[PDB]
Structure formats: C-alpha cells, structure tokens
Amino acid sequence: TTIQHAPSETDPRNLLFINFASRNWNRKRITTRVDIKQSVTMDTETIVDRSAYNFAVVFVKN
Amino acid sequence: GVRQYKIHTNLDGTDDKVWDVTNGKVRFYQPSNLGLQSTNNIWQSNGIGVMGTRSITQPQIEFKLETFGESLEENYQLMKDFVNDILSKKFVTLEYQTEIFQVYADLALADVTKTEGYGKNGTFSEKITFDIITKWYTYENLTFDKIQNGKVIAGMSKIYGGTAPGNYKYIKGTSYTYYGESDIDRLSRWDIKEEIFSFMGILYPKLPKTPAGVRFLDDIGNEYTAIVFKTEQVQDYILINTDVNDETYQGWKGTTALNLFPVMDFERYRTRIIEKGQMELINLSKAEFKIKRKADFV
Amino acid sequence: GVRQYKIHTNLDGTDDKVWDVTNGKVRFYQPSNLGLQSTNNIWQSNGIGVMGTRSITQPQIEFKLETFGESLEENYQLMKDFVNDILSKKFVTLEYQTEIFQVYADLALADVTKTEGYGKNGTFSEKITFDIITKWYTYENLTFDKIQNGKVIAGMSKIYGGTAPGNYKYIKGTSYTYYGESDIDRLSRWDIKEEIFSFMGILYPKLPKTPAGVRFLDDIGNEYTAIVFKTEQVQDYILINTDVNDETYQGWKGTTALNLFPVMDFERYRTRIIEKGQMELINLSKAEFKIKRKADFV
Ligand SMILES: [Sr+2]
Ligand SMILES: [Sr+2]
C-alpha cells in the first residue's frame, strides 16, 4: 500500500493506492547464494492443504 | 588552556541563560564518565566470529556540584536558582570546551542531592546526575559559497584579440580555456560535506502564495527532503528548527508569530537527517543557517 | 625480548594505520585476561562422569589506556584521535607479539572511559574494554610448492645405455627407478596442512569469459568448495577476501574497481572453511595468498 499525490497536476488530492506492480513488467529469475553468516532461519510452510496419514486402514460396510 | 563547562538553558535561543560551572558561583567537578559504551552484537559460529551492528550507548554523567556563596543565604539562593533553571526547560545543553574543541551535549536532570553537611558560610558539596539525550555535537554557522570568474589572459583565454579581426590559437595544453561565465554571480552553493543530524534556520521569503522554504539534494542532483510552506502573505522571516525535542516551525510578520505546521508540505519533507550534497532556496531572498552535527567520542 | 601490542585500523589492507600501544604516545597496560573460559557440559550419573562438548568462551580484554603528552592540548588530541580511529572501522585487529609468536585478535570497542583526573601536563589514565570477535589467529603467507626431476644414474635409471643397442638390468633393490617426468614444471601444489578459516587472495586471470578463480580439494581429491568468476574482459587482478566481517570479491582493471559477486558461481562455493588437502588455480596465470588460521590459547 502506497500514499502518493494524484498523477495529474490539476488534481490537488493526496491519494492511497494498492501496488501489484514490479520494477520489471516481464519479471526475470535471479540466481543467488545465502551464507550461514546472515543469521538464517529455516522453517517449513504448506501452500496446499492435503492429508497427513499416508497409510489407510479402510473399512467398507456390509 | 584549561577545560570550560557552560550550562545553557536554551542554546540557539533568545531566552538563553548561561551558567559557568568552571568559573561561576555554582561549579561542576569530577565528571563520572565522558566516554562511551557499545554493544556490538557479536555472535560466534564454530569459533569464527561474526559482528552485527554497534549500538553506541551513552552513560549518565554525575558531577560533584559545589556552590561558592559568601553567606548561608547566598548558597541556598544558588541551589534554589540553578536547580530550578534546569527544571524550567525540558532539557539543558552542556558545553564541553577545550583548546582543540567546543562540543555540546543535551542533558536531562536525572538526580540532584541536598544535604545539611555544610562547610564554612553554609557551603554546598552535592552530587548532580544527568541523563544523556545526545552526546557531543558541533553547533556551527552554515553559509553559502560564492563562485568567481577566472582572470582573462592573452593566448590562454577564448578571446579574439591582438591583430584584427582577432585571433585565438589551439595549443597543446595551454590552448583555450574559458575565463568564466557571464553573470557568474547567479551561482551559489550551500555545501553539505558531512551528515547533519539537526538544524536551526531563518528564511526570508520573496513572493507570497508560492511555496517558500528549503529543499535538499544529494550528490547526483536528486531531491530527497524539503521544508516548504505555502503562506497567504509575505512573512518577514520563517524560523524553522529541526530539533526533535523542541521542533519549531513559525512564520514571523512584524511582532506576530504564526504556526506554519498545517501549511507545510508533508509529502516533500521525507527525512530530518541531511546527507552529503547541497541545499537550494525555494522562493527566498536571504537565508541564515546554524547546523548541529553529531560526534560519538570527543 | 619484551612483548609488543599494536592496534591496526585495517590489517590486510592498503588503508592501514598502526598505533603502537607498547612504545607510542598512547599505551595499553596490564591486560585483564588473555586466557580462556571453557564450558564442558559435564553431567555425573551415580559417581560416573559423562562429558558433552566444550564451548571455548573468550572474555573481554580490559586494558589500562595511558597517554604521554607534552601539553593538555596534546593528550586531548590523542584521545580524540585513537578512539575515532577505532570507531571509524567496524572492527580493529590487535597484534600480540613475543619472542616466540606473532598472533592477532579481531576486536570491537566495548567501552572507553574519559575522566578529569589528569596527571602531569594533562595525562590520561583510563580503562579501555574490548569485545572478542576472534581470539588469536596466525596471519601468514601461503605459497605453492614446485616439483623437480631426479638425477639420471647409470644402472639405476631406466635408460638403454652402454653397449649398443642399449641395456637396463633388473637387480634386487637397485634395479630400475624412473628419473622423473617429461615436463615436471606442470606439477604445482598449494598444500593445505591445517584447517584455515579465512584468506586474502590476489588472483591474476588468464583468459576472458572462461571461469577464473580457485578450487579446493580434500585428501582424496574431491572438490568441497570453489570461488570462481566468469567476467566479460580480462581483469588485471581479482582481489578476494573471505573474511566474514568484510567479505570482498572485487575485480580490478587499471584504476577501476568492479564488484564481482553477482558474476561468481554460487553452486561451487559451498563453504568458507578450508580443509586439509590442496588448492587448484582455475584460469589463473599468477596468484598471491595470505592465510589466517585460528589458535584458542597462545
Ligand atoms: Sr532550543
Ligand atoms: Sr580488512
């Protein structure tokens, strides 16, 4: 979120906008290295919700 | 020669009151610590040492406050006055002075003692402790620099001289170098050489209803911060102080003082910390600046 | 004979400034502790003792800062200089020298004191405390080793000599031993005998656009780490510093300094800690290395 004065010089209003833009219109992939000296914190996240018991004792009603 | 300790009520101010704690009736002696402490955030992995960021911490200065009165009446009046003067202002400026430097530190009253253990004619020997706001900064005058035209020399400067209809020769090294610029008197640089933390400026506006004040530029000519105000009438002068503790912005016209805070451009004023570059005067006829720049240890 | 303490603004660097705290105007005296505290994590069960891992902890060195100056002006100029010089650089390397060794410690200013208890001609007697980054390391020159061909001996070396069409005899013990190798000048070994923690190499590249730098091999001939760069033009030299605190990977061409970090191969550079083995030169014509290796107690 960014607060900035209206683009047109005639409009004297100060406005609030939401940003979904980048420094490059067609984003490029960067290749870099992270050293242990940078106080690195490693933790695992889950994007998609899928189940955790890999083995299933399935029962079928007679 | 020897060290001098002044105690100012409001330095940079018309209502300043100075106390000589080195020569006057109320004297400061034996400062506890004038140095500094630092926390470097050093974390070590497998014997190898990695260093973070140093937070320079300033410690409380405790002085052996002595009074030099002639009577019990004098010594009491000195304690009732000196201590209340420090209390009247939210913070007091201690000036450290020596043969080589004149630094200043903004103090706040931490602890003062009053006891009935008197010497002769009701003499006082007590301990006064102060809390550090900002330790060691240089309060100095800031002025613009003028550019002057170089002298005209035959054969060296670009001129059509000597035998008619004039002649200028291309030589190797000496060749033709421009003398100066037509009306070089327009060029004025307010140079910023070191990072300034706070300031106090007096600005004289030219045109009313035109944003008036100062903008700051970096080494590449880009604006990062600006103190600009759009008034209705021509103010005699605009008194601006960047000090965090007593921030002052005001427009003076005659004997009347006007608050300029709501009229100020809030988007242009991005930072208080001034970086290496230059200052430009927006709609100003004259400007007077007093710059205060920090030093950790002196 | 006697020991020598020397404070360095930037060791391994061109902008170095050295202060003799043993012989100069500003001296360090009576170090607090030069030893070490160890925590072994020992737990005893039913009289039997079990030992964990020893965390060798390094303690703050507190010196006795003392200036010797002809005038009050001189000693105030010494305190302002020595402290700012330590503050100007993020960390300062203290050199410890004796008849037997020349160790170094990376220090960060923890606390410095300034008081008004002056001796003769205004002489300071204060306490200067330092935080340990790395305690005791050896800064030495690392060079490659050359291999030379063994001498040719009749009967001992593999040659077809004497009576035509030559003869070499199989004896017991003396028999035939190869003299050397054709072009023995190709073999060069940058031997690493003890584990090193950081280094300052000056690499001179050969071919442009071909990855240039250094690679490190273990005792079995396997690569564990490699600092290599793929530049567009031939750099005059690539100045690399593996120090954690001020890591530098810059290329030099003429008087121009270029940062080579984004051009580097990030996959090959797995570790900073160099193990026992050898070092190879990738696309390099010449290389100059300075190796720093740690010692807990000296
Ligand atoms: Sr003030
Ligand atoms: Sr260095």
- Are the beta carbons of B267 and A14 separated by less than 8 Å? yes
CA-based nearest residue to B221, from B189, B246, B248, B195: B189
Contact B298, B224 (CB under 8 A): no
Omega within 30 of 0 (cis) for the link into B165: yes
Q: Which ligand is nearest to the CA of C12?
A: 2
CA B278 to CA B267: how far, in whole Å?
A: 20
Among partner residues A31, A33, A37, which is closest to C269 by beta-carbon distance? A33
Rg (CA), chain B: 27
Which residue of C56, C84, C110 is in closest CB contact with B38? C110
Instruction: Report the run of H or E that residue A14 belongs to, with start and end.
Output: strand A14-17
How far apart, in whole angstroms, are the C-alpha atoms of residue C53 and residue C150?
A: 49
Residue B40 CA to residue B34 CA, distance in Å, equals 20
Q: How many C-beta atoms surround the C-beta of residue B149 within 10 A?
A: 13
Cβ burial, residue A55 (10 Å; 0-12/13-18/19+):
exposed
Task: State the residue for tokens 């003028």.
Answer: B146
One DSSP character per residue, A17-62 reads E-----SSSS---------GGGT-------SS---S--S-------
Residue B193, both tokens: 């050489």
CA atoms within 13 A on the CB side of B2: 5
What tokens does B4 get? Answer: 């001098």
Q: In whole angstroms, what is the distance from residue B37 CA to residue C101 CA?
A: 32
What is the CA B97 to chain-centroid distance, rounded? Answer: 16
Handedness of CA B122, B127, B132, B135 (dihedral sign): positive
Q: What is the spatial distance between Cα B230 and Cα C198, in angstroms, rounded to a whole number?
A: 58
C264 neighbourhood in chain A, CB within 8 Å: 33
Q: Which two tokens stand for residue C103?
A: 């160790």
DSSP assignment string, B109-132: EEEE---S---SSS-EEEEEEEEE
User: Judging by DSSP bridges, how do beta strands C61-67 and C125-142 pair with one another?
Assistant: antiparallel
Residue of B156, B247, B168 whose CA lies nearest to B200: B247
Q: Using the 8-state DSSP alphabet, how is residue A2 labeled? A: E
Q: Which domains are seen in chain B, by residue range?
A: 1-135 (2.40.30.210), 136-298 (2.60.120.880)
Residue with tokens 């273990």: C218
Please tell me the distance between residue B256's alpha carbon and the centre of ligand 1 in angstroms: 20
Distance CA C165, CA B197 (A): 93
Q: Do B40 and C113 touch (CB under 8 A)?
A: no
Distance separating alpha carbons of residues B93 and B134, to the nearest angstrom: 10
Check: CB of residue C198 under 8 Å from CB of residue C133: no
Neighbours of ion ligand 2 (CB under 5 A): C 10, 12-13
Q: Residue B165: how many CA atoms within 13 Å on its side-chain side?
A: 0
- Closest residue in A to C247 (Cα) is A37
User: Residue A34 carries which side chain, given as an amino acid letter?
Assistant: V
What is the distance in angstroms between the CA of the first residue and the CA of the last residue of chain A? Answer: 59
Dihedral sign (CA B10, B13, B17, B22): positive
C63 residue type, one letter: F
Three-state secondary structure along chain C? CCCEEEEECCCCCCCCCEEECCCCCEECCCCCCCCCEEECCEEEECCEEEECCCEEECCCEEEEEEECCCCHHHHHHHHHHHHHHHHHCCCEEEEEECCCCEEEEEEEEEEECCCCCCCCCCCCEEEEEEEEEEEEEEEEEECCEECCCCCCCCCCECCCCCCCCCCCCCCCCCCCECCCCCCHHHCEEEEECCCECEEEEEEEECCCCCCEEEEEEECCCCEEEEEEECCCCCCCEEEEECCCCCCEEEEEECCEEEECHHHECCCCCCCCCECCEEEEEECEEEEEEEEEEECCCC
Neighbours of B274 (CB within 10 A): 21
Cα gap B189→C149, rounded to integer Å: 72
**Which residue in this structure is represented by tokens 């300075």?**
C290
Residues β-bridged to residue C215: C226, C280
φ, ψ of residue B140 to 5 degrees: the values are: -140, 155
Distance in Å, CA B12 to ligand 1 centroid: 6
Backbone angles phi, psi at C204, to 5 degrees: -110, 110
Helix (H) or strand (E) holding A3: strand A2-5
Read out DSSP for chain B? Answer: ---EEEEESSTTSTT--EEETTTSSEEEE--S--SEEEE--EEEETTEEEE---EEEPPPEEEEEEE--SSHHHHHHHHHHHHHHHHHSSSEEEEEE-SS-EEEEEEEEEEE---S---SSS-EEEEEEEEEEEEEEEEEEE--EE--PPPP-TTTBS--BSSTT-B----SSSS-B----TTGGG-EEEEE-S-B-EEEEEEEE-STTS-EEEEEEETTS-EEEEEEE--SS--SEEEEE--STT-EEEEEETTEEEE-TTTB-TTT---SSBPSEEEEEESEEEEEEEEEEE-S--
**Which of A31, A32, A37 comes nearest C244 by C-beta?**
A37
CA atoms within 13 A on the CB side of B204: 6
Measure the N-to-C terminal CA separation of chain C; round to a whole number of Å: 17
Give the side-chain half-sphere CA count within 13 A for B46. 8
Q: How far is CA B13 from the centre of its chain?
A: 12
Q: Tell me: cis bond preceding C59? Omega within 30 of 0 counts.
A: no
The CA distance from B268 to B272, in Å, is 11
Tokens for C122? 């205004």
Distance CA C262, CA C281 (A): 20
Instruction: Note whether B266 and B229 are within 8 A (CB).
Output: no
Instruction: Write out the residues of chain B at the interface with chain A, using a CB-CB cutoff of 8 A.
Output: 43, 45, 50, 267
Q: Cβ of A33 and C266 within 8 Å?
A: yes
Q: Quickly tell me which residue has 């600092």 as its tokens.
A: C227
Residues forming beta bridges with residue C108, ordered by sequence position: C131
**Residues forming beta bridges with residue B199, ordered by sequence position:** B291
Indicate which technique resolved this structure: X-ray
Tell me the resolution in Å.
Answer: 3.9
Question: Rounded to the nearest 5°, which phi and psi values hold at C244?
Answer: -60, -45
Please answer whether residues B251 and B235 qualify as being in contact, where contact means their C-beta atoms are separated by less than 8 angstroms: yes
Closest approach of A14 to chain C, Cα-based (Å):
40
Which contiguous run of DSSP H or E holds residue A4? strand A2-5
Residue B167 CB contacts under 8 Å (≥ 6 apart), including other chains: B160, B161
Rounded to the nearest 10°, the torsion over CA B7, B12, B15, B18 is 20
Cα C171 from Cα B103, distance rounded (Å): 91
Amino acid residing at B122: G
Which two tokens mark C232?
């567009």
Q: Would you say C294 and C132 are in contact if contact means Cβ atoms under 8 Å apart?
A: no
Task: Find the B255 Cα to ligand 1 centroid distance in Å.
Answer: 20
CA separation (Å) from C286 to B177, C205, C253, C282? 46, 7, 16, 10
Of C136, C76, C133, the C-alpha closest to C109 is C133
